Design a protein around this ligand. Structure first.
Ligand SMILES: Nc1ncnc2c1ncn2[C@@H]1O[C@H](COP(=O)(O)OP(=O)(O)NP(=O)(O)O)[C@@H](O)[C@H]1O
Ligand SMILES: Nc1ncnc2c1ncn2[C@@H]1O[C@H](COP(=O)(O)OP(=O)(O)NP(=O)(O)O)[C@@H](O)[C@H]1O
Ligand SMILES: [Zn+2]
Ligand SMILES: [Zn+2]
Lengths: 280, 276
């Protein structure tokens, strides 16, 4: 008069009426709020307007290291991203968090009396975005014959409740981190195509902006760069020469114009010699 | 080449102060745990086991709900890791009432709420495994197919407590029968099938189990009470937290009214003698 269940079916039902093992894997990671410098036309970056996000986003980061790299105004520390709301950051990926040295703050305190650290961070990220916009124009217009594209990492603003502070965050690059040119206007002698293109990019920024801006301190791993110095070639104000906090050498633009050596890429881009006259 | 004013303007704008107003995130991040199955496509022959790795989900509060032993609030899931929950979908989050936690405070030394939630979710999975079997064995002459919603375990630090979460159903929410055996009078085929289902569970399990408190929208159900019809004590009578009267079984057998579906399923009279 029926077709009732079997042993297996009965076992699986009765087992649910009992306590079943539940071992929640321990909670590791530090909660943070991420802010992004948005773009009006991400597809045409060089014609897009930048504006800071309003509503913060949740993310979790694993502070897996105490190793603070660098000797400049900031120190970089690697962290891991467990998760990020809307995946603004990549889960299970290493990132670098950068903060300034108290000294540096104290110095800018006399300019940024309030929320010094946050302001310096806002400027650092805006500075990198400026470099990105110039590279976007560069890759877009550069001759097809050129095989390399300088690329700057995206940098986000991060606020750590636990650490009670703001940081700039970007993907951690694995590889030989090197410098093509520096804050003194000096450059390396190229050994290959990649390096020739990096060096030519700096020359190109000066020409392209009709002499108003010079991007120096090109550095990173391969084509992927970070932390450049976008210099307002003619400014004279104390701390208004570089988009972001940087220590410029003795008359860096002068040195650059005098020491830069054009290469096969510079000529491929039709750039004129820096040593020429400004007016004549 | 061409270095426009718009291009120059947007570059130079980055050298100056651009307004920044840090606004705290909206909603709250929560940790979700799932009661996994070894054989989803064959749920009634599958083993249930709790997941270990809790995944994040982002929820935003919308409104509210109360019934007997729980408080419920409707929320929006805007994003979640590996889509453990569906982004852009509505969910209902439920937490136990004071009295209920105070009733199991002795039964469950520590993590009372955690266990209450675990048992509640397990109870619904049991009913689900039964609806699965039902849909497999029922005659093709029976159209509709009852189904229980999957319930997930949730942890929220904002509130510092555990909850159960499930998809929010849209439509008129109604109860077909309850824990004391009362039944609505079926006004359509679907309600008949629902009423026939509770009877089917009893017969299918050889009088060992009975699913009451059928409720939901259309053929989608939630919040059932799975009763071990042979226990002589309420304390060990229901799978998860549930309001039952020791008269439940007897009452259901006495009150239940078989319908065309019950007959379609060839179900015997619940009033009959059990040793005959
Ligand atoms: N994206 C990255 N990936 C891997 N390593 C990095 C990355 N960025 C920086 N680093 C390393 O950490 C150090 C600190 O970087 P950074 O803060 O940019 O120093 P800096 O160039 O001296 N600038 P500053 O701090 O403004 O004076 C670098 O010299 C690298 O060795
Ligand atoms: N999945 C759902 N979708 C839409 N509404 C729901 C859902 N679940 C519950 N509700 C509503 O909220 C009320 C209370 O349900 P709930 O929070 O699940 O617990 P409850 O009060 O413990 N139920 P019960 O055990 O049957 O007495 C219901 O009567 C419905 O109106
Ligand atoms: Zn050159
Ligand atoms: Zn019946």
């Amino acid at each position: 008069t029926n077709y009732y269940y079997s042993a297996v079916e009965r076992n699986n039902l009765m087992r649910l009426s009992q306590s079943i093992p539940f071992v929640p894997v321990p909670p590791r990671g530090e909660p943070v709020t991420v802010y992004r410098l948005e773009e009006s036309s991400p597809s045409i970056l060089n014609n897009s307007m930048s504006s800071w996000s309003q509503l913060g986003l949740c993310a979790k980061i694993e502070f897996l290291s105490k190793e603070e790299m660098g000797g400049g105004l900031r120190r970089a520390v690697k962290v891991l991203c467990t998760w990020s709301e809307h995946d603004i950051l990549k889960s299970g990926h290493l990132y670098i968090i950068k903060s300034f040295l108290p000294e540096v703050i104290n110095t800018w305190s006399s300019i940024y009396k309030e929320d010094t650290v946050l302001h310096l961070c806002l400027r650092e990220i805006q500075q990198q975005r400026a470099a990105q916009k110039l590279t976007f124009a560069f890759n877009q217009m550069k001759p097809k014959s050129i095989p390399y594209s300088p690329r700057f990492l995206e940098v986000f603003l991060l606020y750590c409740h636990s650490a009670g502070q703001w940081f700039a965050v970007e993907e951690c690059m694995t590889g030989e981190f090197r410098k093509y040119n520096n804050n003194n206007g000096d450059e390396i002698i190229p050994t290959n195509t990649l390096e020739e293109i990096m060096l030519a990019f700096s020359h190109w920024t000066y020409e392209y902006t009709r002499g108003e801006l010079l991007v120096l301190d090109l550095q990173g791993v391969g084509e992927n760069l970070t932390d450049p110095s976008v210099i307002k070639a003619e400014e004279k104000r104390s701390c208004d020469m570089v988009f972001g906090p940087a220590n410029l050498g003795e008359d860096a633009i002068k040195n650059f114009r005098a020491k830069h050596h054009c290469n096969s890429c510079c000529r491929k881009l039709k750039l004129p010699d820096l040593k020429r006259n400004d007016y004549t």
